[PDB]
Amino acid sequence: MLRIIQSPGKYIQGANALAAVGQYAKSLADHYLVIADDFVMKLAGDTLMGSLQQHGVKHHAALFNGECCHKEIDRLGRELKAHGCRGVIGVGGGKTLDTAKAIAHYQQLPVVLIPTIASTDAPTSALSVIYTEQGEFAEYLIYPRNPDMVVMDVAIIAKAPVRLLVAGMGDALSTYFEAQACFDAQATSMAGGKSTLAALSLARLCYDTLLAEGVKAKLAVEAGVVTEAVERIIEANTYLSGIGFESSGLAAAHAIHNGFTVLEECHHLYHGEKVAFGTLAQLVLQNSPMAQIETVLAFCHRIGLPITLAEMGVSGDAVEKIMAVAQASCAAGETIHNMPFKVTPAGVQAAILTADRLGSAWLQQHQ
C-alpha cells in the first residue's frame, strides 16, 4: 500500500574518482576513521589520504582484520571514539564495507563507501548479509538508513580480476527477474513498501545494460582498461542493481542462492556466480518461455557464469542434496515466498534439477 524507494545520498563514479574523494567527503564531515585492510591501503591509501589532505579533511587509518564480526566492530567503534572522528570511510571489499556500515551505524555517523571491486550490489544498500562461520546463510541484517555516499573508481575496478566483474554481472542478472516477480506479487521490498515504478525500471535497465554492454565490458577489463561499456556495467552492478534489489524486491534467485550455502561443494564460488544459476532456476520455477531461457543461457555462457550443477561443483546423485537446497530456500521468512504463486520445496527441487538439464543441453549444442 505505501510505495517506498530509498537510496544512498550520493553515488559517484568514474576513472580516478579516488583522487577526488576529498571534495565530496568534506561535505559530510571534516574528520574520518578510514577502515581498510593492508592490501587495500597499499593499493589505494596514498591517493585517498592525498585527496583528503588536499581538502582539509583529517583522517586516522585503521587496519581492518578481514572479518565483519561484532568484536572487530566494537573494537573499531572504541578507536573512533578515542581520536574524535566524525565520519567513517570504508575502502575495499565487501567485508570491509559491511564493517564500515556497522561502525557508522553504532556511532551514528556519516559513511562514505569506496568499493575497490564491483562483484556484488551490496554497497548502496542499508544491508549486510550474515553467514555462519561454516559459510551458511544466517540472516539479512537491515540498517535504518543507506550509506551517505558510494564512490566507484572505475580505473581501480578495471584493474581488478575479470572474474570479480563477472560475478557482479551475475548478481545483477537476477535483479530484473526478482523485481518483476515481486512487483507482480505486490510483495513488500526491504525498503518497507510496494515497489515504485522507479525501482522496477532501474531493475529492468540493469538487465538491459548487461545484455548490451556485458561482453564489451568483460573484454575491456581483460585488457585492464576503462571504456564507456565498463562505466555502464559498473553502474549496473552497483547502483541499478542495488536500488532494484533493495527497493524493488528479492525473490527466488537469492533464496536459492541461500539454499546452496548448505552444500560444501559450492561454498567457495563467488556470490554472483551462484546467484546466476539461482536466476536460471527461477526462470524454470516461473515457466519463462524458451526464448528467454536461451537469452540468459547465452549471456551466462558468453561471460563465464555457471549454467549447470557440475559448474557449481555438484555431481552424482544430487537428489538429496538439491532437496536440502530446496528446503532451505523455502524456510519461513525467505524471499522465495515473494513469487506471485505458491512455492514448495518440491517445486524448487524440480526447477533446479531441470535448470541443470537445460544448461547441459545448451552446452552440448555449444551455443
What minimum distance in Å lies between the beta carbon of 259 and a copy of itself?
16
* Residue in 121, 148, 271, 356 annotated catalytic: 271
Q: Are 13 and 154 in contact (CB under 8 A)?
A: yes
Spatial CA neighbour of 203 closest among 246, 234, 164, 258: 246
Helix (H, G, I), strand (E, B) or coil at 88: strand
Alpha-carbon gap, residue 143 to 146, rounded angstroms: 7
Q: Which of 60, 257, 267, 301 is catalytic?
A: 257
Grid cell for residue 80: 573512533
From 106-114, 163-171, 205-213, 260-268, span contacting Zn ion (CB under 5 A): 163-171
Q: Rule CB under 5 A: which residues touch Na ion?
A: 121, 171, 174-175, 241, 245
Active site residue: 121, 148, 171, 356, which one? 171
Distance of closest approach, residue 35 Cβ to a copy of itself, in angstroms = 20
User: Counting Cβ atoms within 10 Å, is residue 139 exposed (0-12), middle (13-18) or buried (19+)?
Assistant: exposed
Smallest gap from Cβ 1 to Zn ion, in A, equals 27
Look at residue 85 and give the partner it binds from Zn ion, a copy of itself, Na ion, none, a contact being a CB closer than 5 to 8 Å depending on partner kind. Answer: Zn ion
Closest CB to Na ion among residues 34, 253: 253
Q: 154 CB contacts (<8 Å, ≥6 apart)?
A: 13, 14, 15, 17, 226, 230, 231, 234
- According to the binding rule CB under 5 A, does residue 83 interact with Zn ion? yes
Q: Which residues contact 132 (CB under 8 A, 6 or more apart)?
A: 138
Nearest CA to 260 out of 290, 246, 241, 281 is that of: 281
- 184 given a catalytic annotation: no
Residue 60 near which of a copy of itself, Na ion, Zn ion, none (CB within 5-8 Å, type-dependent): Zn ion
Q: Which partner, Zn ion, Na ion, a copy of itself, none, binds residue 175 by CB below 5 to 8 Å per kind?
A: Na ion
* Residue 173, C-alpha cell as written in the block: 542478472
Identify what 17 binds: Na ion, Zn ion, a copy of itself, none; CB under 5 to 8 Å per kind. Answer: none
Q: How far is the CB of 291 from Na ion (least distance, A)?
A: 23
> Are the C-beta atoms of 140 and 335 separated by less than 8 Å?
no
Contact status: 339 vs Zn ion (CB under 5 A): no
Clarify whether 366 is annotated catalytic.
no
250 contacts 173 by C-beta, under 8 angstroms: no
Q: Which three cell numbers stand for residue 262?
A: 548448505
Is-contact 85 110, C-beta < 8 A?
Answer: no
Q: Which residues bind a copy of itself (CB under 8 A)?
A: 15, 159-163, 212, 215-216, 219-229, 232, 265, 267-269, 284-287, 289-290, 293, 304, 310, 313-318, 346-347, 349-351, 353-354, 356-358, 361, 364
> Site for Zn ion (CB under 5 A): which residue of 29, 40, 44, 85?
85
Active site annotation includes 208: no
Paired residues of 3 in beta bridges: 194
Closest separation in Å from C-beta 141 to a copy of itself: 24
In whole angstroms, what is the distance from residue 68 CA to residue 279 CA?
A: 27
Catalytic residue annotation = 171, 254, 257, 271
